[PDB]
From a paper:
We obtained crystals of Se-Met-labeled ctPan3 PKC (residues 205–640) with P1 symmetry and four [name] homodimers in the asymmetric unit that were solved using single-wavelength anomalous dispersion (SAD) methods. The ctPan3 structure consists of an N-terminal pseudokinase domain (residues 242–497) to which MgATP is bound, a central asymmetric coiled-coil domain (residues 499–538) and a C-terminal domain (residues 555–640) (Fig5C). Although ATP was bound to both pseudokinase domains, ATP was not added to crystallization conditions and is present in all copies in the asymmetric unit of the crystal. The pseudokinase lacks almost all catalytic residues and is predicted to be inactive (Christie et al, 2013). Two distinctive beta-hairpin ‘ears’ protrude from each C-terminal domain. A kink is formed in the coiled-coil region as a result of one of the CTDs (chain B) interacting with the pseudokinase from the other chain, introducing asymmetry into the [name] dimer. The pseudokinase and CTD domains of C. thermophilum [name] are similar to the recently reported structures for Drosophila (RMSDs of 1.13 Å and 0.87 Å, respectively) and Neurospora (RMSDs of 1.24 Å and 0.93 Å, respectively) proteins (Christie et al, 2013), indicating high structural conservation of [name]. The principal difference between these structures is that the kink in the coiled coil of ctPan3 is more pronounced, resulting in twists of approximately 28° and 31°, respectively, of the CTD relative to the pseudokinase domain. Second, the highly conserved [name] pseudokinase/C-terminal domain also binds RNA but in a manner that is not specific for polyA (Fig4). This region has a theoretical pI of approximately 8.8, and examination of the surface potential reveals a substantial positive charge that could mediate electrostatic interactions with negatively charged RNA backbone phosphates.
Residue numbers in the entry:
A (entry chain F): 213 to 354, 363 to 543, 547 to 631
B (entry chain E): 215 to 352, 363 to 541, 555 to 631
């Protein structure tokens, strides 16, 4: 079913570059204000549709830079929220600051502000650059969602619900617009604890009851992805379940049916639900580790590039210096010169220059490691040649450099 | 805890693993194979033990000749190949297998270059790996670590059993820690080849023992006794029950039990640890984020490296001005004549060069008579023109 590269970006380097670029963007002179601890606000909303569907208030999301640690965060703003009870913020925030989960966007702070020209309620989240909602990704008007992708989503939401429910809390909001893809097939709940504050007090439903609602909302989320119609527009659930049954396996239809069902005399628990998707959970555990290996591979390659870069800088500092006289032309530095030629002045038998990057990187790594491998250094007149090991070259190399450190 | 799969010092860890990968021993008695060279022994202790495969087993780090990559070679000493059909068939079945908790096998071949008839299995190479035996048997194992191992072994068994195969070998000496709390089965398909003509038991029967061997592995870690020396399973089960929760004791008992009259399947076992599997799904992903964080910080190192290498290849076959620029950046000298080695200046100048900034610098020849006022934009132009001239020649 699923591919090994399930959690793997196609081009990790560009992806990181684009995300870094998106993280640093600022608007020099915007009408947006500066908060006591936040500045350089940048809107992330593609469309400023004054919509109140999710929280009963219009909501904006800003990328902002914190003043204390200088890191970037996502600020969720509820326009027009008037603080009547400070306890709503303190109690909800006290419960959610504990939560740390790979499938939930962390909340750090909740506060009210007047800097926007009104009474606004601000929620400060982790920032995930170039994130798009499941709504934006799958429902935006122009294809069918692969079943393995849905199972991936199910396992990640299940992961979130395990942590949330175990802490005597509920994921009040499971709408597609409030679940973001922070990377390929990687989803996180983007709006936790907001409904906890908005519905504080006036709510009468208990925790367990709210948790029962999480499963229904969970089931409607899957149904939306399978049918392509948003949850709020699902008029005929039986008709949707039957659409799902024709496109997907019986296993998926059974899971969604268990999530939607409220007529059984048994209370639904995340414990029971996980037991039923154990096989899928193991598969995406595997895929996560394989992607970990992929990231470790690239990370190891770039850390070594860092080491090589510092070696190349030292090399450039040593050779052809200005100024003992002819210091770079005599003794050890002369061999270092021929080594440079061997690595960076490679030429084919025909006489054409060879610019293979691989030969160059391999040689510099062997130099740092001081490998007991021999190479043939050829003089520029080439009448004379020298056989040296990388271990020996490293010795000359370190000795030539620390002479300059002596001179300070 | 959240940092379950996260090394304490990733920097030091990667450096050591890099050194271990490139290391060679100049003159050992070890031979050169048709497609392998620079063999390096990985056996920590050279005690000749034949318990696992009935033959002494050696592991070498070797460099492939076709591709320049490093691999782990498992050598079975004194094994003479009797059936040619056995090797190919076991291979085509395991060549498919790709799993995060199993060391990939690539090739199987016989050799006489070692001074005897040896059977060689070529694996992926995981530098500075240690076995569970070396790690745990050479304090009490936290229960969280054991569930971690169980999920990874369970993961491995799902893929193996689904391919109508069995993990013949689950001993602690053939399960390696390739990183913190990260285990992989190091010896798959070896017993498949050795016992090909002799084994009469079916696939399903072999799979039932895997669960027993799995259960014996866990009991060993909880009690501190090697599987081969577990004389009293009931007493060990009671020890485990006194040190650990009832959940673990239940899992181990299910793995060991063969009296239930019910065929054990990996499907059923996975169902019973569904919650544990979810926790470690989370932990793998949080480590995913951790590695991505460091990678983002390190990603520019490649570009910086190529800029310096580019500079080194153009010079010493417009070139004159580039020479003063190199001098300006890497040959700074104090008023006394002493060399200045500030790293910040070097990085800044190469960064401005790459960016082609319109900022001007004053280049002076060592003879004070000639000077050049140039911008980094102009220097980048020459820098690029000088290079693509060499690409032309190639
Ligand atoms: N933590 C975050 N980091 C980065 N981007 C985020 C984060 N949370 C949300 N976003 C992005 O901000 C944008 C706006 O999100 P929002 O929830 O407002 O969606 P919306 O389409 O405006 O829905 P609504 O109509 O309910 O406001 C989305 O593209 C989303 O991916
Ligand atoms: N695929 C691999 N990549 C890297 N290192 C490995 C690999 N497989 C095994 N090793 C390492 O090689 C060493 C040899 O262990 P091996 O199990 O072959 O013998 P042993 O445990 O020393 O003794 P015995 O042969 O009695 O088991 C171990 O330290 C192990 O971590
Ligand atoms: Mg919005
Ligand atoms: Mg050995």
């Amino acid at each position: 079913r699923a591919t090994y590269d399930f959690f793997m970006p196609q081009n990790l380097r560009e992806d990181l570059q684009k995300k870094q670029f998106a993280t640093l963007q600022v608007i020099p002179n915007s009408g947006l204000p500066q908060l006591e601890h936040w500045h350089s606000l940048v809107p992330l909303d593609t469309s400023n549709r004054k919509n109140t569907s999710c929280f009963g208030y219009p909501s904006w999301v800003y990328k902002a830079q914190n003043s204390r640690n200088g890191r970037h965060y996502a600020l969720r703003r509820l326009e027009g929220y008037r603080l009547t009870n400070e306890k709503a913020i303190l109690n909800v925030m006290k419960d959610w600051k504990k939560i740390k989960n790979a499938s939930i966007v962390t909340i750090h702070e909740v506060f009210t502000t007047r800097e926007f020209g009104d009474s606004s309620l601000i929620f400060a989240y982790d920032f995930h650059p170039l994130s798009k909602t499941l709504q934006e990704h799958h429902f935006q008007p122009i294809p069918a969602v692969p079943e393995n992708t849905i199972w991936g989503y199910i396992c990640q939401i299940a992961n979130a619900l395990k942590t949330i429910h175990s802490n005597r809390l509920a994921a009040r909001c499971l709408e597609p617009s409030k679940i973001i893809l922070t990377d390929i097939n990687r989803i996180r709940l983007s709006a936790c604890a907001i409904l906890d504050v908005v519905q504080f007090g006036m709510n009468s439903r208990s925790v367990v009851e709210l948790q029962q609602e999480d499963f229904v909302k969970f089931g409607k989320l899957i149904l939306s992805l399978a049918t392509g119609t948003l949850p709020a527009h699902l008029n005929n659930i039986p008709a949707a379940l039957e659409t799902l049954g024709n496109k997907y396996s019986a296993n998926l239809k059974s899971a969604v049916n268990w999530l939607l069902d409220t007529s059984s005399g048994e209370t639904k628990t995340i414990e029971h639900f996980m037991t039923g998707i154990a096989s899928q959970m193991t598969t995406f555990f595997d895929l996560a580790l394989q992607d970990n290996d992929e990231k470790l591979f690239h990370l190891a390659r770039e850390v070594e590039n860092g080491r090589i870069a510092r070696s190349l800088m030292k090399l450039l500092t040593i050779l052809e210096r200005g100024d003992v006289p002819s210091w770079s032309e005599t003794g050890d530095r002369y061999q270092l010169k021929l080594f440079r030629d061997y690595v960076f002045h490679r030429v084919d038998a025909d006489g054409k220059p060879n610019l293979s990057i691989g030969h160059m990187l391999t040689c510099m790594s062997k130099l740092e490691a001081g490998v007991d491998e021999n190479i043939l250094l050829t003089s520029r007149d080439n009448e004379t040649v020298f056989v040296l090991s990388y271990r020996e070259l490293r010795q000359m190399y370190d000795r030539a450099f620390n002479e300059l450190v002596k001179a300070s």
